[PDB]
Amino acid sequence: PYLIQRLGIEQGLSNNYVLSITQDKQGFLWFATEEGLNKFDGTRFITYYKEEQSSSVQSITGNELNEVYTDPVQPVIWIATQRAGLNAYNYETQSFSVYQYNPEDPQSLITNDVTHITSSVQAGKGLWVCTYYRGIEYLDIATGKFTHYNKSTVPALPSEQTWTATEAEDGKLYIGHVEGGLSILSLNDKSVKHFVHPGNDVRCIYKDTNGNIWIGTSKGLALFNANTETFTNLSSYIFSIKQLKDNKLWIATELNGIMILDLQQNFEFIREGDNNYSLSNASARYIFQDSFNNIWIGTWGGGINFISNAPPTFHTWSQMNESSLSNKVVSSVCDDGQGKLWIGTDGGGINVFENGKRVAIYNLLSNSVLCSLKDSEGNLWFGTYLGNISYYNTRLKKFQIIELEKNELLDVRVFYEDKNKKIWIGTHAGVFVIDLASKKVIHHYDTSNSQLLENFVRSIAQDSEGRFWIGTFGGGVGIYTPDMQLVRKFNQYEGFCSNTINQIYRSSKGQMWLATGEGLVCFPSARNFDYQVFQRKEGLPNTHIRAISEDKNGNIWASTNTGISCYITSKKCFYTYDHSNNIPQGSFISGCVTKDHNGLIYFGSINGLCFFNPDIAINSPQIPPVVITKVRIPGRLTSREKNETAIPISEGEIELTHEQNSFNLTFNVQDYSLANQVEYAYMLKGLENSWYTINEQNSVTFRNIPPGKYEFLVKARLHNQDWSEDTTSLRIHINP
């Protein structure tokens, strides 16, 4: 159901025990961990740690953090440390301010273990700060001074240990106590309605955008209305609840990862595991949705998990799942015109699928299903390895159907039905033509009794003039008239690109397409025998074509050794797709393709049955803006100083000294979905007035640049699109 990308140390994250997440007003995501503050730039994390001997710089005041929180109004990330007070990072000015306990006030913070932060009703007028030990603090950001709510000042309180607190009602403050149950405080009254037992350790209070009061406790989630003062209620620890754009309730549990309560049920889980569609740990801590709608997950041990805002365009079927293939390699697929797919495997039997669910497996003689055909009468033909035809009649039975005498065992690998209800059958032993209407066999062509070129038939298909194009193993293809007069043939040493021709395809436009060992070949008109070979040089890696289909429009799609590629007949060019787009990380199996009654296309591979749409629409992914995230001078080897100085970009420009005339700018794209699949190009006006690409990297380092004014321009683009007109710029002045 979901595709879950992972992020931790490999990406630079300081710690894998992630507890809180937000996004600053300039798009960057901040992560609070059990050791360090991390700001993710787009590819890599920047960690913030407590400073030591440096009563010079000021940083966070303690490494163990509880929460991060974006000020509604100001360019500030508020940081709740668990043992050192409240911290506040202004990302605009880039400096840390601190709020600690001071016995010399004490209109200062009462105790410096902060567990939660939220803004007041009219935002940025103040913020609420919960403590573990000594009650709730209210900071007036105007004065910079705390008012204390605890049982020294509100004797009506049942407890001063607090996890969260929010003004769920205008001037009613809802408090979750540390194993105390929840309290409601009317501020205008200083009276308390306190509930005990839901579960008693109340860890989260959440107001739905619809005004529903959700509550996360140690004994499960409960819905609340102060309307009637009653709860309503699999019952494990809950850490945070957020309703997403989906209008779905996403809840972070201690043992079962994530649950989702879909508000159009008038539950569903994402647990821990080790795969594309599972969490990296059983205890999820925090959930956060992007400005881009990406879902980010804080995991108590297993770093960050990330779910992209848009679904994968490509899918793959492959201890038994609902949709688990009973073998890892798919060698044939076949659509009966009734809504099921019979998937043939090279190890299991046939897995029949309907609506993404295995509905039957098949014991059939030999369980290496290498080819399949739906006949015009609507029955099904599967050829196996060293097993004859296993014929499935849609009168529920399946009979075996022999070929050679003493019922000899044949290596069948292609079935072709012609305009005339004959089925042509490619064998290692030549061709057999079997009459559909009645008698089971007409012809058997070979090296000895016909003009057939080789016996090892692999691939057979029909002309718009009705000639039979028969392909072989290692012998190319030959065109035969229906009486098996050789019309013309195509060899490697005759002139053709390849001898291993893998599939022959008549497109609906009437042209013939061949998947060869080294090119996708097209004969634009069967009144000619002219042909075009598409290879490396014309926008197609890799060159070894396995299977072909065609979409709603003109375009023909091909499976290859590396990916899936698409020939846009409109534009006269290629779209390539690769593991980057969620494709099975194998090579694809030759000829193994089928289409949906809905237009969906399926290619088989050594890694599952992969399937997709007409989401070349991938042009609609808008060109994403480039953000320049860091400039730093690369350090001289002199070997006395770590951390090589970073120059801050102020007014969209940068002043460097003569000394710092070498500099390296890094750039990112803020949507992490698109990180996977963006190429960058730069131009440095004032040095060279021309565009350069840069492969697999997001930083450029210029060295020993002469004094002057320059301007760095950098633009991105996605996998299948042209370079944008739009650029992002940085003006650069080098002094002497």
- List Cα–Cα distances, 533 to 359, 361, 496, 550, 569, in angstroms: 41, 40, 9, 18, 14
Gap between the Cα atoms of 452 and 433, Å rounded: 13
**DSSP symbol at 368:** B
First to last CA, the chain: 60
Q: Rounded CA gap, 615 and 599, in Å?
A: 12
Q: Extract the tokens encoding 729.
A: 């710029």
Tracing tokens 């499976």 back to the chain, one arrives at: 559
From the list 712, 713, 718, the residue with the least C-alpha distance to 734 is 712
Domains and CATH numbers, the chain: 1-311 (2.130.10.10), 312-615 (2.130.10.10), 616-736 (2.60.40.10)
The answer for residues whose C-beta is within 8 angstroms of residue 4's C-beta and 6 or more apart is 270, 276, 277, 278, 279, 280, 305, 306, 307
Between the alpha carbon of residue 29 and those of residues 48, 195, 529, the distances in Å are 13, 36, 59
Range 380-404 burial, b when 16+ CB lie within 10 A, else e: bbbbbbebbbbbbeeeeebeeeebe
How far apart are the C-alpha atoms of 387 and 367, rounded to whole Å?
9
Q: Which residue is listed with tokens 């509604």?
A: 72
Burial string for 420-455 (b: 16+ CB within 10 Å, else e) reads eebbbbbbebbbbbbebeeeeeebbbeeeebebbbb
- Written in H, E and C, the secondary structure of 532-566 is EEECHHHCCCCCCCCEEEECCCCCEEEECCCCEEE
The coordinates were experimentally obtained by: X-ray
**Strand, coil or helix: what is 92?**
coil
Cα distances (Å, whole numbers) of residue 672 to 40, 276, 293, 294, 583: 10, 16, 10, 8, 19
Per-position DSSP letters for 236-286, written without gaps between them? --EEEEEE-TTSEEEEEESSS-EEEEETT---EEE-B-SSTTSBSSS-EEE
| Rounded Cα–Cα distance for residues 483 and 431 (Å) | 13
| Per-residue tokens: 178 | 């540390």
- Residue at 90: amino acid letter: N
Asked if residues 203 and 218 have their Cβ atoms less than 8 Å apart, the reply is yes
Task: Kindly state the tokens that stand for 126.
Answer: 């103040």
Distance CA 516, CA 369 (A): 22
How many CB atoms are located within 10 Å of the residue 183 CB? 23
Nearest partner of 127 among 113, 114, 141, 115, judged by Cα: 141
CA–CA separation, 305 vs 11, rounded Å? Answer: 12
Distance CA 330, CA 532 (A): 30
DSSP state of 524: S
Give the resolution value in Å: 3.3
In angstroms, the CA 154 to CA 158 distance is 9
Which DSSP symbol is given to 673? G
Query: φ, ψ for residue 581 (rounded to 5)?
Result: -105, 20
Could you tell me where the beta strands, DSSP code E, fall in 606-736? Answer: 608-612, 627-632, 653-656, 663-668, 678-685, 688-694, 699-702, 708-718, 728-734
Ordered strands of the 422-427 beta sheet: 412-417, 422-427, 430-435, 443-445
Beta bridge partners of 610: 316, 603
Written as one letter, the residue type at 325 is: L
Distance of CA 611 to the CA centre of its chain: 15
Q: Which of 334, 433, 325, 338 is nearest to 380 (CA)?
A: 334
Tally of CA atoms within 13 A in the half-sphere of 558 that contains its CB: 35
Strand partners, 533: 521
CB-CB contact of 191 with 216 (8 Å): no
**3-class DSSP assignment, residue 417:** strand
